[PDB]
Design an enzyme around this catalytic site. Structure first.
Site, short mmCIF file in Angstrom:
data_model
loop_
_atom_site.label_atom_id
_atom_site.label_comp_id
_atom_site.label_asym_id
_atom_site.label_seq_id
_atom_site.Cartn_x
_atom_site.Cartn_y
_atom_site.Cartn_z
N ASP A 1 0.79 -1.21 0.00
CA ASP A 1 0.00 0.00 0.00
C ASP A 1 0.83 1.28 0.00
OD1 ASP A 1 -2.73 1.28 0.35
OD2 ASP A 1 -1.78 2.01 2.18
N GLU B 1 1.64 -0.50 -4.99
CA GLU B 1 0.72 0.51 -5.51
C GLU B 1 1.39 1.88 -5.53
OE1 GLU B 1 -1.60 2.46 -2.88
OE2 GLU B 1 -3.01 3.35 -4.31
#
Ligand SMILES: [Ca+2]
Ligand SMILES: [Ca+2]
Ligand SMILES: [Ca+2]
Ligand code: NA
Length: 483
Positions: A234, A264
């Site tokens: 993340d 990400e």
């Protein structure tokens, strides 16, 4: 040997109800998904967030997998620890891999405050201090009263963080950077806003030795406990770039597992993505955000979008082996942070594109597969399943591209000898339908192909040269495979 394509599935969406049933559903659907060719599942954060309803990104305790009574409940929004482990068991029994969501950027839901010397920085340029130093009351004390010292005795305090965005004493919102020996925003990080290290809650100081050691210990503990197969990282653009290759190599060597990882890095600028991959030595794949924007743009252009430009400046094109392709995700959903929902009419075309082409590792979105009741968005399982079968049995071998028309574009896969019956010819159009001669391979001469999607009832016969005149309806997709 006999090859099988890899296909990932993000198994969650933003608006799921807080009923602790997700882990159970994974266990219940494992075999169904497995039979369709799904080889790996990306599960949401399994540890305790700021409350039971937290989607998971407001991480409180990495060691509480819905096992301790903290933050108002024992279970997470998804279920309990025992249920999570059973879900992993079912996935493995069905032959699938499980990727776990890792949130290392920040920490929220602190148990108490601490007085800390801080300085305000410019929200648009975090490198510029805009005030003098002063004492604030920050939410940085983490004691984990429900867990105690089980698994880890580590307690978090203000010096493990770089800053916060709230002064509890004056009740003010400012981007506060902490003062102290060696205190500063981490580098290298994304340059938007000067230095994009700070995002939300209490920002982790990746330059602090003890933080790095603690996260490395958690990594090993997590893998040894759950036996997961990989990670989904993340908000990597807000985390010191050099931290991950270090953390990953440690966890991989200590556990002996290859641990596939996808990060990400949210940006539509292919250059920033190139930089990141270069800075991390190709140690992890990245989600192809630029391609998502393309899909989105085309879906709203009413046919005027030039399909010949679909792949230009995307990771799928530039780094096919380090790109995880997708159509939509929990952040692009309506009403969400990065909302840029691909219109339904175009959605099946986008899936055909990422599921039948050789470039990239495709990821199917839970919301698209099961629908999103929140916005009366229906299930597209009927449209996606045929495409999953295409990838599973037919999308193999040498590819031939036909991105040579502003509306109708196509590609073919010759198939492979080790996979008898393989071979495919796909066409998609963002405007009126038509036909296109494409080369499927001399080896398929004389064979008759049919539309696996069911969209067209006619058939195509391959000539002696290995060419066929394939067809497609307007604003649709047809995937031709040998009978
Ligand atoms: Ca720092
Ligand atoms: Ca950060
Ligand atoms: Ca067009
Ligand atoms: Na930091």
């Amino acid at each position: 040997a006999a090859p099988f394509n890899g296909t990932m599935m993000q198994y969650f969406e933003w608006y799921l109800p807080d009923d602790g049933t997700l882990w159970t559903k994974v266990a219940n659907e494992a075999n169904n998904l497995s039979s369709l060719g799904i080889t790996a599942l990306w599960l949401p954060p399994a540890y305790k967030g700021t409350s039971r309803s937290d989607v998971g990104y407001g991480v409180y305790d990495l060691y509480d997998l819905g096992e301790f009574n903290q933050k108002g409940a024992v279970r997470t929004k998804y279920g309990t620890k025992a249920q999570y482990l059973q879900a992993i068991q079912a996935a493995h029994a069905a032959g699938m891999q499980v990727y776990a969501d890792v949130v290392f950027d920040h920490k929220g839901g602190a148990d108490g405050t601490e007085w800390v010397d801080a300085v305000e920085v410019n929200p648009s340029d975090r490198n510029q201090e805009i005030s003098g130093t002063y004492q604030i009351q920050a939410w940085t004390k983490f004691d984990f009263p429900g867990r105690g010292n089980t698994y880890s005795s580590f307690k978090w305090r203000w010096y493990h963080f770089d800053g916060v965005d709230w002064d509890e004493s004056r009740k003010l919102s400012r981007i506060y950077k902490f003062r102290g020996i060696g205190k500063a925003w981490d580098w290298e990080v994304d340059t938007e806003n000067g230095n994009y290290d700070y995002l939300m809650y209490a920002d982790l100081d990746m330059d602090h030795p003890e933080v790095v050691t603690e996260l490395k210990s958690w990594g090993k503990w997590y893998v040894n406990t759950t036996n997961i197969d990989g990670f989904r990282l993340d908000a990597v653009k807000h985390i010191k770039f050099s931290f991950f290759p270090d953390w990953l190599s440690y966890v991989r060597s200590q556990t002996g597992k290859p641990l596939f990882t996808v990060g990400e890095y949210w940006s539509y600028d292919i250059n920033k993505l190139h930089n990141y991959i270069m800075k991390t030595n190709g140690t992890m794949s990245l989600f192809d955000a630029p391609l998502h924007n393309k899909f989105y743009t085309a879906s709203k252009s009413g046919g005027t979008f030039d399909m010949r430009t679909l792949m230009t400046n995307t990771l799928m094109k530039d780094q096919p082996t380090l790109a995880v392709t997708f159509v939509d995700n929990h952040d692009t959903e309506p009403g969400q942070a990065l909302q840029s929902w691909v219109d339904p009419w175009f959605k099946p075309l986008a899936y055909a594109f990422i599921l039948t082409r050789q470039e990239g590792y495709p990821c199917v979105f839970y919301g698209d597969y099961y629908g999103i009741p929140q916005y009366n968005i229906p299930s597209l399982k009927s449209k996606i399943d045929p495409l999953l079968i295409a990838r599973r049995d037919y999308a193999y071998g040498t590819q031939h591209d036909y991105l040579d028309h502003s509306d109708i574009i196509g590609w073919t896969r010759e198939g492979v000898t080790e996979k008898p019956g393989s071979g495919l010819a796909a066409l998609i159009t963002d405007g009126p339908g038509g036909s296109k001669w494409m080369y499927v391979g001399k080896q398929h001469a004389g064979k008759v192909f049919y539309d696996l999607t069911g969209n067209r009832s006619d058939t195509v016969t391959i000539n002696s040269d290995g060419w066929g005149e394939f067809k497609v309806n307007g604003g649709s997709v047809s995937v031709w495979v040998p009978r």
